[model samples]
Target: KSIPFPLKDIKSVVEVFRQELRNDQPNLAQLSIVLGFFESASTMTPSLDEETFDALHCKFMALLQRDFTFNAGGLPATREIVKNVADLVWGCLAKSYFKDRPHIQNLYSFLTGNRLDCFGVAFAVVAMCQALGYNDVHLALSEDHAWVVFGKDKIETAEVTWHGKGNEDKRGKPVIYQDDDRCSWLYLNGNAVHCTRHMEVASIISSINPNINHTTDSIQLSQLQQELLWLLYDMGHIKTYPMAIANLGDLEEISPTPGRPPAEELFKEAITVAKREYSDHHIYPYTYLGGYYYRKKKYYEAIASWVDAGYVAGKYNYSKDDEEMYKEFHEIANDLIPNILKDAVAKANLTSDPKFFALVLQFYDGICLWEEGSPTPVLHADWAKKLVQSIGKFAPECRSAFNANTDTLSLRSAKMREMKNLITNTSAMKLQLTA
Candidate 1:
C-alpha cells in the first residue's frame, strides 16, 4: 500500500508519504524513504539519492533475514527477539560522536552512516522489527527519550537506545517490578507515549531537519515537512504527540498556512494534548507558545504562558537529564523576556499601567517558587539581579504595580494568587528605597 518512489517535486514527496500512512498497516521503511531523501532540488545535501530506494528496501530485508530467525507467527515478537533487535542496533552505533547533532533521524542516515542518535536508534529498531514482520513491536516515547514495547499484549517495554552521556544501556535488562520508584522516574515523569504506526510517522516528520546553516534553512525541505505534518494533522495522527504538535506549530509560525488555526492556537493545542493526555508534564508545549507570544508582541500572554510553564516544570526534579528544560527556561528568562520589555518601549506606553509588568513579576515568581523544592537549585543571585534590574528599567507607573507590600493588591487574574505574597516581598524591598 505504498506509492512509487518519486523525487520529482514537493507534491511527489508528500503524496507518497500520504499514501503510506493511508494504508491500514503502513510500511515505515517506505515512509522513511520519502522522509529522508526526497529533496526537491538539492534542498539539502543528502548522503544518498532517490535512485537507491529499491536497494535500500532490499538492504533491510537482507539484514533482518540474515541476523534474526523469524518463526511462523508473523507478529507479537517476544522479549528475546525484541532484545536481540535492540542489542544489534546498540552494538553497531559509533563509539564516540556528537550525540545531539542533526541529520541523523532517518533510515538513510543509519543505513549509510552507521550513526544514529538515541531517537534514531530506537526508531531504527522499530523500523527493523516492522520489516521483520513483528507487528507488535512499536515505539514508546516520552518527553526526553524513546523505547519499544512488544509481546502479544504490547506491555513488554525495553530501552532501545542510551539516554544521556556516560550511562550504560539497559535495553535487555529485567524490569524490576517490586519497587514503584521506577514508575515515574523511569519514563521521565511516567508520561510515556505508546505510539501507533501513524503517530510513529508523526514523530519522524517532526524530526525532519531543513537547516543548511545556522542562519539559513532549506525552503523546500521546510515546505515538505510542513505539508507532511499537516497531512498527519489532517488524519489525527499527531494529537497524542505533543512535541510533534509543537514542531508543527513552529513551522506554521514561520510561514502560516491559510485555512488553518494560527500558530497561536497550534501551540495552545500542543499544551492541551500534554495536559489532557499526558498530565501536563511536558514543557515544550508551554515554552513553544511562550516563544510565539513573545514574537507576536503579546507580552502579557507570553508572561502567563511562562508562568504556567515554570509551575509545570516545578513538578519535576532538577536532575542531570533535565539540562534541556533548564536551558529552555533560561532562554525565556535571559533572552526572550528581556527582548520583550526593552522593545516594549517601542510598542508599550509608559502611562498605560504595567499590566505587562505584573505578569513579568509573576513569571519570575513562578520560577523561583518552582525552584523551592527541587534537588538542584534552579536560580541564583545573578539571575535575580538581572531580572530586578530589568524590572527597574520600567517606568515608575509600571513599577508601581508591585508597589504594595500587601496581599490586598487586587489582581483579577486568579492565577496570580500563588505569586502574590512573593511579589510583595520584593515590592517591600523596593518601597524602602522609595520611602
Candidate 2:
C-alpha cells in the first residue's frame, strides 16, 4: 500500500479509465473525456505537465457549458443522481487507478475504509456537478461528515446517522443507507467542499447584484433572494430578519414575509450566534444583519450596517462600553463578509482592532473559514500563521486523508485557486480578506 509508483503507472490507469468511460458511458462521456485528459497527464511520462493540465481544465469547463441545463425543476433528483453517479464512478476510478500506490490509492479506497468521512465523495460530486455546468450546487461537511444542498434547486442530502444515539442496540450501525451515506467522502480535485462553493458563488452574486433592483418584494426578488442567501451563506453568516426569515429557503420560497419563524430562521439564528461565540467578539451580529441585507441584494443597506459596526469599533476601543459595542458590531460585521474583508484591512492596527486581527489570523488557521464556518480564534498561532503565509501563494488547507503525495504541487495549487475564485469577488479587499 505504501509503495510509490512512477507517474507513468498513474497515467496508464487514468488513460484506461478515460478511454473506457467515454466509450461505455456516453451519457457521461464528456465527463470521462475530461477525466481522461487530466488522468493521462497526471500519470504520463512528463507527470502532469502544466500544458496538459490546463488543457484538461479547459475541457472540463467546456463540458460544464454543454451538460448542464438550468431548470429549477430537476434539482432534487439531480442532487441525488449526481451524488450516486459520482460516487459510483469515482469508486471505480479509485479501485482501478489507486489501489497499488497506497498514498495515491488511498484517495479512492477511502470510500469503504472511512464510510463516515465525506470529503472525497461529497466534495468531488459537487465539484463535478458544477464543472458539468450545474450551478447553484451548495455543500457542507463537518469533521466526521459531509452533505450537499443545492440552492435554487432546493434539493438536499446530508450525512444522516442511523447509528443509534443512546440506548438503542444497533449502536454503531448507521440508519442511513450505506451507499448514499457520505462518510467516506474526501476532498476531490484538492479542494474542500465549502471553499469550492464559496469561491464559485461570489463572482456569481456580484455579477447579478448590480443589475437587480435592491428593494424588490419577496416574490419580486425571488432570483436575487436565492442568489444573496447563497452569497451570505458562503460568507459564513447572515442575520435573520423578519422578512428574510419568512421567505429565504431555496428558489421555491426565496424570502418569505414572516410572522412565524422557519427552520432556516433557526439555523440562521444558530449560525449567527455561533459566529459570535466562536470568535468571542461582538461586531458579528451587526455584520450578520448587514450580510442578510446584502443577501437580499440590498447593497446600500449592507453598507450602512457594516459602517455602523466600524463606527462602534472606532468609538468603543476595548473599554466596557467598547466591548459591548464591539460585541454588537462583531455580531453584525462578522457575518457581513466580503465587506468584512475591507474592514479587516482598514482596521489592521494591532490594538484597536482585535476583530481585524481575528480575520488575519483565520487566514493563518489554514482551514477554509467559509466552508468550515468560523474557525477557533488564535493570535498568530503556528498553523494559522503558516496558512496565512500560504494564502494566495498556494492551495487552501486540505484534509490529510484525501491528500495524495503523487499529486503535483502546482496542480494542487491550481485547483485551490480555481475553487477559491469560484465564489471570490472582483474588489481587491474582498478578494484578499474573504477569499
Candidate 3:
C-alpha cells in the first residue's frame, strides 16, 4: 500500500519542492539539490555518504559563479554574456559518457561527477545563468531539444547543449530552425512551451526519472513526483504543458487523489489545452485520449479520437524527422484500428452505427491527406493488406450512407450532431443500414 508520507528523504524533498515552487520565485538550484538527494537517496542508506543540501547548494552556486565573471551590474544575459556562460557550462561537461542514461538529468552529478546529459547541460546553463542573477535568460524548449533564449524580446536563441546529432560545437548558434522547425516533432510544430522561471522547473520535474530497474520502481519516488506535479498543477504553472498535464493525467489514472477530477477528465482537458493553445498542431493528446478510450472499451469514442489524431498528422508532411508520429499513426492505422474492427465484426448482432463507419472513413481520409502532403508515403503496399481487407466484411450495400466522394477533413460537427441525436432523440435521421 502507498503511504501519505514516504521515507524521510522523500518527505523532506516533497516539502521543500513545494516551498521553492510556491515562493516569490522558485530557486532552480535549490530544487536541483532536493532532486539530487532524492534520486540518490533511493539507492543509498544513512551509512552512505550523500551530498548535503549545504554542500550541493554551495557547489552549484560556486560552479556557476566560478568561471567567466560578468560585469558587476547584474545585467540580464546579453549575447556575449550568454555565450560566455554557455562556454563555462560546456567546458565542465564530460566529453564521453552515456548521456541518455538515467540520473544524468539533475545537477547533482553535473556538479560533482563533471557529467550532464543533453537536457541536463541545457538546464545547467540556464540554472547557472539564474545563479549569476540574470532574469532575462530562460530555457526555450521543444519536444526533443532544448536551447536558451534571452534579450529584450526573448528572441535571442543559443544552443547550450549538443542535441546529439550531426554537428558538434554548436555553441551560441541558435539557428535550430535549419530543418528542425520545418519538420515536426511532438513540440515545436509551432507548439514549443516557452519556459517561465517556474515553467523552467517543469523541465526538471518532467524529466525526473522514476525507474529503478527494468521491472521495478521506487514507489516513494513515484508518489513524491506525483504530488509535486499536483502542486505545480494547482499553482497554475503547468497549464500550457500538455505533456506534463498528460503525465499527471496518467499518474492520476493509476490511483487518483480523491476530490480531484477523474483521469478521463484530465485526458480530455489535455486535448482541449492542445487545441486551444496550439491550434491543434499536437497529435499526442488525441492519441493519449484514443488509447484511454480504447483501454476502457469505449469503441466508438476511441475510434473517433483516432480519427482526430489522424487529422492532426495530416497537417504535417511525413519527413523522417516526424518519426515519432509516423510510428503512432502507423501503429494505429495498420494495427490498432484493424483489431478494433475485428473485435466488433465478431459480434453476434453485427449492427454497428454508420457514424462509426463515418469515423473509420474519416480516419483513413486523414491518413490519405497526410500521405498526399508528405515527401514520403505512409500507406502500405499489398504486403500490408491488413487494413484494406477488413472493409470487405460489411455487405455491399452496408456502407453507402454518407457521401461517397469522401474528401472530408473532419466530421466533428456532423458526427457530434448525430452522436447527440442518437443519444437524446432516440434513433432519428441516422442511417442504420451498415455492418
Candidate 4:
C-alpha cells in the first residue's frame, strides 16, 4: 500500500529518511520502513518522474553537505563536512560500509542496508547523481575496479576508498597524488585517474527485475534499470587486494659505510656522499633537501632543489639500478614543483611587482631543461603558457621577458644539436687520423 503522504515530492522522501537516520538505534525494521516507502512509491512509479527527480537529487546532496561528517579511515558519518557532498558520501560509504565487501557479491548491497564494495558505492553514487539531474554521472570501470564520475563534458574520476583530505596515505607515506580538495579525491594512481577517460562505464540495462530482470537504472530499482549484468561482472575480477602503488620500490636511504655517522650528522653527510660518490645519479639527497625546505615553507628553495634532482636524473643514463625509482622521483617532482610555481605566480599577481614572477619563470626554465629525456617532464608547455598568459594579463612588460626566456630555450635546443653534430664529426676525424 502506498504511504498516504505525498510521495511525489522528493523533499518528503528525504525528510523521512532523515528522521529514520536520527534515531539512536536504527534497526532493520526502521531501515525496511524507509525501503518500503521507496518500494511502494516506486511500485506505481508515482507522479515523481524526471521533473521532480532533480529536486530530490539536489535536496539529497544538500542534506549530506549540510548535515554529514565523513571519516577518511573508514568510520561512520559524523556531523562535520568533508570537503563536499560528493566527498561526504564517498568517504562515509567507503569507510563504514564498503570495508570488507567484494564487488561481485555486494553489487546491490549499497542500495539496501548491507555492506557496499567499490562497485556498489560508485554505482549508487552514479544513480543518485543521475537521478538528481546529473545524467553525465557514470560508473567508471578500470582494469579491475570501479569509481564514480561526477562531471559533464569534463569528467572527474574518484576512488571511493581514498575519499578524504590530507596528503598522507594509510601507511603514512606522503600522498603526492590527490584529487581537487574542493570536491572528489583526485589521484588514486598518479595519472591513472586521468586515463579513465579512455576507459568505459556501465552501458546497458540487461533486465528490469531483480529475479526476472527487475534491476533499475539506479541499478537498485525496477522502474528504470538500463544496463547489462555481464557488463557489471565484466568490470574485471572482483577481489579485495592490498592497494599499493604499482612498481613503487622502496625509497633508498643514504648509506654510511666508511664510518657509521651519528643521526644528527646524516643529512650533511648524505649531501657529501651524493655529490662525491653518487655524483649525477643519486636523487635521495636532493629529495631530502627539498623536503627540509618545503617543511620550512621555503617554497622557492624546495622547487630549486627538486629541479636539481630532476636535472641529475636526466643527465645520467645507467639502467642497472631500479629505474622505477626515477619514476617515483619524477612523479613527486611533477606534483610539487609546478604547484610551487602556481603559488608563486598567484602571490605575485596580487602585487604590482614582477619579482616573484621572474623567479618562477627562471625556475620553470631550469625545470624544463632538467626534465629533458627523463621519463617525466616537470610541467606541460600548455600549463606553463596558461600561467604565463595570466601573468601577461597583469604585467605586460613581463610578457616580453617571457618571450626572451623561451627564446633562450630555443637557442639551447640548437646548441644541443650542434654539439651532437660536433661529436659525430670528431669521431670521423679520429678514424681518418688513425688510418
Candidate 4's C-alpha runs over 4 A off are 1-268, 317-334, 341-435
Per-residue error (Å), model 2, residue 428: 64
- State which candidate, 1 or 4, has the greater lDDT: 1
lDDT of each: 0.71, 0.34, 0.69, 0.37
lDDT tens per residue, model 4, 39-141: 3344334443343334443444554456543333443221111124345444444344435422212222333343444334444444444333344444444
lDDT of 3: 0.69
Candidate 4 local lDDT, residue 62: 57
Rank ordering of all candidates by TM-score, starting from the highest? 1, 3, 4, 2
Please give the lDDT score for candidate 2. 0.34
Please report the TM-score between candidate 1 and the true structure: 0.84
lDDT of 1 by residue, 91-119 (tens): 66677768786787777666666667888
**lDDT rank, highest first?**
1, 3, 4, 2
Name the weakest run of 10 consecutive residues (lDDT summed) in model 3.
426-435
The candidate that achieves the highest lDDT relative to the unseen native structure: 1
For model 1, what is the alpha-carbon lDDT of residue 228? 92
Residue 120 of model 2 has an lDDT of 38
lDDT of 3 by residue, 99-188 (tens): 777887888778778877778888888887777777678887765677888876556777777764525677887644556324555335
Off by over 4 Å in 3: 1-7, 40-51, 112-114, 164-169, 175-183, 186-189, 349-353, 371-384, 389-435
